């Protein structure tokens, strides 16, 4: 007891130091940043908030544990008050209550008592200015607390957060409206909480009404104030409207627009993966392979760990339907390895045309595919592999006989081979002529693609791609 | 990233890309290509 | 002080793939147990080979005499440190006590490596460390310890020159280049040849000639393949002593494909029965084929495979799927006509496809600076 | 007011949005004004 | 989503499914099965016939379809298999 008793006091000062100065330096700093300039936004503290919340989402959040009473949530949410420069006294009173945890017997004011606490910035009379700071006070205590996931009676407090922070949404739409620049700072905060909206419902029931409530904030951001706001709302749509039926696939046509400009960076990179799985159910491979490839190369920085790895797993799924794929272990990660083992040997059976090997993969490894929901392709991927097998042979040989390729690709009969080659010509896969007597297939080398034709015509898209980046560099140069 | 539902749900490894093409095709192979000597 | 125990690692792979002889490999292993005071070499071989009967007191009076020889070196640490001298006191507790790693397990290894590491004022003693890390990583297949010590060996000992132990490093990484997959630097670091001469860590130099000649038939191109052997002085006499290797070397330049499938199997026999070549022989097979098939299809624009049946003796359906599985993997792109008995050459890589490396590698390049351009600012 | 002081702010927001947009375009001009005066001084350097 | 089980629900999901296969549209074919997509291959043999029927159209069939046209529950598919002919 004396050994562990003396080690209890030291830690809580650590949240009283860094976690204090988290919203003391940033929040007190963003005060003057959100009072003016306010260009854009920027307000880089809102992006610095991405380097805090996501950092806090591991440690320490607000709590924790660490060996405190979880009294940081009531501390900053009380006594806002605020006014002219005496707001420093509020930060000074935040230092005064630090000794309360270390001296007296500490008491936990979270949970049940957090209901009037979120009303206090309104009850302090008055805020009087920044809702994003109170939105932060209605989120950063509660939303990182959602990671506990105890599911008992505190989920309605997570809903009470989504209630009183919807009262912040009431102050979001009603207040300002003219050169706000807090909404663009809130578009990062409103995004997150709307993400936590979707997350909290997934543990109880998927949201039917919030789907209607999503289009509310969706449509109302147009055209008055929209920067990055509708994109994050469109991400909420395509995320869940994918996993749940129906008709949401073709919905992307009337929504886009794009919506420009893509923000922020990797945030829009995953969006191409979302519509990527969509366009995969449209059966169009070519537009799906370019949006999936662009989804990996445009996505920084990780780690950790498998969040980027699992999304990359199902990303190369469109490559299984392309018909041209290499062995995917070049994309393997030691952490993703154990999870991709049932999905690994799959593509290894795609490179071969054996039915007994391909069907054995579906039987044993089909259990892993149930969680992915990828069973739509397994019926049409049989027709994809037979195109890869015939392309391997047709590219390796000038002439290929139907009887020799019959059992080599084990089509087993001459009649269905005439049906496959016919549809292969219909799809433009093979140029082979066929001489029908028994019959047999006699092809010839295809040429004249040459030099003067394809490379210089493709270079029209290459330079038009490059000369636009010259403007992209100038536009990016004009901001500094 | 880590937002949205991302978190919700030489070496021999480099040669293993090509090495697995040996597993499903033509083994390595010595014995079979060594048996083809006296076949014809 | 390696080859007697370095051959126990040869005995491990001799036990590993073939199961035929368990007595012949355990007799010289026990003969290596009754000398050199080997303990774990026969303990890890006790699971692979037979579990006797009894070793025990026969080899326990050894590990006791080892312990007597171990304690007298452990008595030498406080007896010599009673006096004072530079590096001389604690130099006796490295080479012979890391020779006790040769006795057994890693206990001699790990505790005698770092214990003597801080004192040594000479780079030769620090490399004897790296030496004994390379043998234990050869004995036990673990690849970790032999990668790191060589990295420590290149920084300190190369400062700086040496003739003797530095040429061994080029052999070690060259042996590591053939341990993992590197063709080009394997024979490149093996260019030293007789300058290393023969050493306990170089085993039999004639076998080192076999290691460098098998990588030199791929990585060393045909103009340079005949050059290094014919123009190279010291390397030419050792290959002429072996009629099997020298034949296949000149027959490769002679282009006859009738003796290849025979002689290449003889090389594959050595490639099958040698350690560290087990993962690497699979791609080695058809890489020497395309090496012989490179010059093959370059000869004629239209070639009949019946004329290939002559040289192959007789390829009919064998090269049908063989050469087809070469094209699918991107090796030697060519067009071979089926049932028409015609091979077409091609592919004119001097113009069209050779341009594609510009933009393709330049796509992800410029894409990487597109995304990272939107980061600045924000 | 209802026309109004709630709507006019949104009207004033458009101008302030364009003012910040213009300031962004101005910030693109301001640093570009330096590239002129620099080379304009360099145009005096060849005359120097 | 909680509703009592019905009877005719089975084949009518297939009636519009096979009628839409007769008009050659591939897109709306699989999206109609998205009501229970995970259980398509797992259960509901009434859904298993069209997904195996489309498999034979890629063979093509012709032959295998008419052999499977010998035994069908169906039910009511008789009108649509005549348009599947044309």
Curated annotation (Swiss-Prot), chain A:
Domain PCI: 269-448
One matching Pfam family: Rpn3_C
Stretches the record annotates as Disordered: 1-52
One GO term of the biological process aspect: ubiquitin-dependent protein catabolic process
UniProt xrefs under InterPro entries: 26S_Psome_reg_C, CSN3, PCI_dom, TPR-like_helical_dom_sf, WH_DNA-bd_sf
Cross-link position per record: Glycyl lysine isopeptide (Lys-Gly) (interchain with G-Cter in SUMO2): 21
Gene3D superfamilies assigned to the protein according to its UniProt record, in alphabetical order: 1.25.40.570, Tetratricopeptide repeat domain (1.25.40.10)
One Gene Ontology molecular-function label: enzyme regulator activity
Key word Cytoplasm present: no
Compositionally biased tracts (Pro residues): 1-15
Cross-link Glycyl lysine isopeptide (Lys-Gly) (interchain with G-Cter in SUMO1): residue positions: 21
Disulfide pairings: none
One Gene Ontology term, aspect cellular component: extracellular exosome
Keywords: Isopeptide bond, Phosphoprotein, Proteasome, Ubl conjugation
Superkingdom of this protein's organism: Eukaryota
SUPFAM superfamilies: Winged helix' DNA-binding domain
Phosphoserine, modified sites: 401, 413
Role of this protein: Component of the 26S proteasome, a multiprotein complex involved in the ATP-dependent degradation of ubiquitinated proteins. This complex plays a key role in the maintenance of protein homeostasis by removing misfolded or damaged proteins, which could impair cellular functions, and by removing proteins whose functions are no longer required. Therefore, the proteasome participates in numerous cellular processes, including cell cycle progression, apoptosis, or DNA damage repair.
Subunit: Component of the 19S proteasome regulatory particle complex. The 26S proteasome consists of a 20S core particle (CP) and two 19S regulatory subunits (RP). The regulatory particle is made of a lid composed of 9 subunits including PSMD3, a base containing 6 ATPases and few additional components. Interacts with UBQLN1 (via ubiquitin-like domain). Interacts with ERCC6.
UniProt family annotation: Belongs to the proteasome subunit S3 family.
Curated annotation (Swiss-Prot), chain C:
One GO term describing the cellular component: proteasome complex
Keyword field: Proteasome
A GO BP annotation: proteasome-mediated ubiquitin-dependent protein catabolic process
UniProt cross-references to SUPFAM superfamilies, sorted A to Z: TPR-like (SSF48452), Winged helix' DNA-binding domain (SSF46785)
The keyword Hydrolase appears for this protein: no
Source species, domain of life: Eukaryota
Pfam families referenced in this protein's UniProt entry, alphabetically: PCI, RPN7, RPN7_PSMD6_C
Positions of the PCI domain: 182-350
Gene3D superfamilies according to UniProt: 1.25.40.570
Assembly and interaction partners: Component of the 19S proteasome regulatory particle complex. The 26S proteasome consists of a 20S core particle (CP) and two 19S regulatory subunits (RP). The regulatory particle is made of a lid composed of 9 subunits including PSMD6, a base containing 6 ATPases and few additional components.
Protein family (similarity comment): Belongs to the proteasome subunit S10 family.
Function in brief: Component of the 26S proteasome, a multiprotein complex involved in the ATP-dependent degradation of ubiquitinated proteins. This complex plays a key role in the maintenance of protein homeostasis by removing misfolded or damaged proteins, which could impair cellular functions, and by removing proteins whose functions are no longer required. Therefore, the proteasome participates in numerous cellular processes, including cell cycle progression, apoptosis, or DNA damage repair.
Protein name: 26S proteasome non-ATPase regulatory subunit 6
Organism: Homo sapiens (Human)
The gene coding this protein: PSMD6
Curated annotation (Swiss-Prot), chain D:
Annotated compartments: Cytoplasm; Nucleus
Superkingdom of this protein's organism: Eukaryota
Subunit structure: Component of the 19S proteasome regulatory particle complex. The 26S proteasome consists of a 20S core particle (CP) and two 19S regulatory subunits (RP). The regulatory particle is made of a lid composed of 9 subunits, a base containing 6 ATPases including PSMC5 and few additional components. Component of a complex with USP49 and RUVBL1. Interacts with PRPF19. Interacts with TRIM5. Interacts with NDC80. Interacts with PAAF1. Interacts, in vitro, with the thyroid hormone receptor (in a thyroid hormone T3-dependent manner) and with retinoid X receptor (RXR). Interacts with ERCC6.
Family: Belongs to the AAA ATPase family.
Function: Component of the 26S proteasome, a multiprotein complex involved in the ATP-dependent degradation of ubiquitinated proteins. This complex plays a key role in the maintenance of protein homeostasis by removing misfolded or damaged proteins, which could impair cellular functions, and by removing proteins whose functions are no longer required. Therefore, the proteasome participates in numerous cellular processes, including cell cycle progression, apoptosis, or DNA damage repair.
Record protein name field: 26S proteasome regulatory subunit 8
Residues of the full protein shown: 11 to 58 of 406
Swiss-Prot record, chain E:
The organism's place on the tree of life at top rank: Eukaryota
Organism placement in taxonomy: Eukaryota, Metazoa, Chordata, Craniata, Vertebrata
This protein's name: 26S proteasome non-ATPase regulatory subunit 8
Role noted for this protein: Component of the 26S proteasome, a multiprotein complex involved in the ATP-dependent degradation of ubiquitinated proteins. This complex plays a key role in the maintenance of protein homeostasis by removing misfolded or damaged proteins, which could impair cellular functions, and by removing proteins whose functions are no longer required. Therefore, the proteasome participates in numerous cellular processes, including cell cycle progression, apoptosis, or DNA damage repair.
Shown part of the complete sequence: 180 to 265 of 350
Subunit structure: Component of the 19S proteasome regulatory particle complex. The 26S proteasome consists of a 20S core particle (CP) and two 19S regulatory subunits (RP). The regulatory particle is made of a lid composed of 9 subunits including PSMD8, a base containing 6 ATPases and few additional components. Interacts with DDI2. Interacts with TASOR.
Family as reported in the entry's similarity comment: Belongs to the proteasome subunit S14 family.
């Amino acid at each position: 007891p004396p050994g562990g008793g003396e080690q209890e006091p030291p830690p809580p000062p650590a949240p009283q130091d860094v976690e204090m100065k988290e919203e003391a330096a940033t929040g007190g700093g963003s005060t003057g940043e959100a009072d003016g300039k306010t260009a854009a936004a920027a307000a880089e503290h809102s992006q610095r908030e991405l380097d805090t919340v996501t950092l806090e989402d591991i440690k320490e959040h607000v709590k924790q544990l660490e060996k405190a009473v979880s009294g940081k949530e009531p501390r900053f949410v009380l006594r806002a008050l605020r006014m002219l420069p005496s707001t420093s006294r509020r930060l000074n009173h935040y230092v005064l209550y630090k000794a309360v945890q270390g001296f007296f017997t500490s008491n936990n004011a979270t949970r049940d008592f957090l209901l009037p606490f979120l009303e206090e910035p309104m009850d302090t009379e008055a805020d009087l200015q920044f809702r994003p700071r109170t939105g932060k006070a209605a989120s950063t205590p509660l939303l990182p607390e959602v990671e506990a996931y105890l599911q008992l009676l505190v989920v309605i407090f997570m809903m009470n957060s989504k209630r009183y922070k919807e009262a912040q949404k009431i102050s979001d739409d009603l207040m300002q409206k003219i050169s706000t620049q807090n909404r663009r700072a809130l578009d990062l905060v409103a995004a997150k909480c709307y993400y936590y909206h979707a997350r909290v419902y997934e543990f109880l029931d998927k949201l039917d009404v919030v789907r209607s409530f999503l289009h509310a904030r969706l449509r109302t951001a147009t055209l008055r104030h929209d920067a990055d706001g509708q994109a994050t709302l469109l991400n909420l749509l395509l995320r869940n409207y994918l996993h749940y039926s129906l008709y949401d696939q073709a919905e992307k046509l009337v929504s886009k627009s794009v919506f420009p400009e893509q923000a922020n960076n990797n945030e829009w990179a995953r969006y191409l993966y979302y519509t990527g799985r969509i366009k995969a159910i449209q059966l169009e491979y070519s537009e799906a392979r370019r949006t999936m490839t662009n989804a990996l190369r445009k996505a920084p920085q990780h780690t950790a760990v498998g969040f980027k790895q699992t999304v990359h797993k199902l990303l190369i799924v469109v490559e299984l339907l392309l018909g041209e794929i290499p062995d995917r272990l070049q994309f393997r990660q030691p952490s993703l390895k154990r999870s991709l083992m049932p999905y690994f040997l799959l593509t290894q059976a795609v490179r071969t045309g054996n039915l007994a090997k391909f069907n054995q993969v579906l039987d044993q490894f089909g259990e892993k595919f149930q969680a992915d929901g990828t069973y739509t392709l397994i019926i049409r991927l049989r027709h994809n592999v037979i195109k890869t097998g015939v392309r391997m042979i047709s590219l390796s040989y000038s002439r290929i006989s139907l009887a020799d390729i019959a059992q080599k690709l084990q089509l087993d009969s001459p009649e269905d081979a005439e049906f496959i080659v016919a549809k292969a010509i219909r799809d433009g896969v093979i140029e082979a002529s066929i001489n029908h007597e028994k019959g047999y297939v006699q092809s010839k080398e295809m040429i004249d693609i040459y030099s003067t034709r394809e490379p210089q015509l493709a270079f029209h898209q290459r330079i038009s791609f490059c000369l636009d980046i010259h403007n992209m560099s100038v536009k990016a140069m004009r901001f500094p | 990233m880590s937002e949205k539902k991302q978190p919700v749900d030489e070496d021999n490894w480099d040669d293993d890309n090509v090495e697995d093409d040996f597993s499903n095709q033509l083994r390595a192979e010595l014995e079979k290509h060594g048996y083809k000597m006296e076949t014809s | 002080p390696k080859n007697p125990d370095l051959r126990i690692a040869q005995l491990r792979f001799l036990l590993s793939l073939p199961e035929h002889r368990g007595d012949a490999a355990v007799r010289d292993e026990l003969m290596a147990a009754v000398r050199d005071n080997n303990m774990a070499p026969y303990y890890e071989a006790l699971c692979k080979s037979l579990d006797w009967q009894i070793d025990v007191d026969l080899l326990n009076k050894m590990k006791k005499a080892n312990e007597d020889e171990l304690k007298r070196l452990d008595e030498e640490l406080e007896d010599a440190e009673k006096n004072l001298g530079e590096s001389e006191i604690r130099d006796a507790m490295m080479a012979k006590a890391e020779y006790l790693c040769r006795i057994g397990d890693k206990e001699g290894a790990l505790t005698a490596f770092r214990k003597t590491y801080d004192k040594t004022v000479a780079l030769g003693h620090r490399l004897d460390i790296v030496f004994y890390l390379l043998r234990i990583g050869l004995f036990y297949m673990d690849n970790d310890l032999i990668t790191r010590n060589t990295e420590k060996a290149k920084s300190l000992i190369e400062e700086g020159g040496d003739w003797d132990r530095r040429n061994r490093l080029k052999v070690y990484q060259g042996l590591y280049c053939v341990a993992i997959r590197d063709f080009k630097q394997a024979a490149e670091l093996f260019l030293d040849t007789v300058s290393t001469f023969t050493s306990y860590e170089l085993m039999d130099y004639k076998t080192f000639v076999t290691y460098t000649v098998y990588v030199s038939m791929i990585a060393l191109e045909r103009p340079d393949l005949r050059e290094k052997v014919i123009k190279g002085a010291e390397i030419l006499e050792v290959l002429h002593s072996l009629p099997a290797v020298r034949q296949y070397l000149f027959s490769l330049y002679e282009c006859r494909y009738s003796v290849f499938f025979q002689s290449l199997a003889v090389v594959e026999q050595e490639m099958k029965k040698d350690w560290l070549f087990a993962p690497h022989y699979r791609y080695y097979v058809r890489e020497m084929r395309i090496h012989a098939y490179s010059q093959l299809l370059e000869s004629y624009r239209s070639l009949t495979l019946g004329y290939m049946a002559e040289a192959f003796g007789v390829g009919v359906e064998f090269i049908d799927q063989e050469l087809s599985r070469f094209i699918a993997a991107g090796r030697l792109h060519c067009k071979i006509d089926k049932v028409n008995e015609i091979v077409e050459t091609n592919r004119p890589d001097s113009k069209n496809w050779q341009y594609q490396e510009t933009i393709k590698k330049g796509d992800l390049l410029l894409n990487r600076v597109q995304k990272l351009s939107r980061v600045i600012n924000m | 007011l209802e026309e109004g002081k709630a709507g006019s702010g949104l009207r004033q927001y458009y101008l302030s949005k364009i003012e910040e947009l213009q300031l962004i375009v101005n910030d693109k001009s301001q640093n570009l004004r330096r590239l002129q005066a620099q080379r304009n001084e360099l145009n005096a350097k060849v005359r120097l | 989503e909680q509703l009592p089980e019905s009877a005719y629900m089975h084949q009518l999901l297939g009636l519009n499914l096979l009628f839409l296969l007769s008009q050659n549209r591939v897109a709306e074919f699989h999206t109609e099965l998205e009501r229970l997509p995970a259980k398509d291959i797992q259960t509901n043999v009434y859904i298993k016939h069209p997904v195996s029927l489309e498999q034979y159209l890629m063979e093509g069939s012709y032959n295998k379809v008419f052999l499977a046209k010998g035994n069908i529950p169906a039910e009511s598919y008789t009108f649509f298999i005549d348009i599947l002919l044309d």
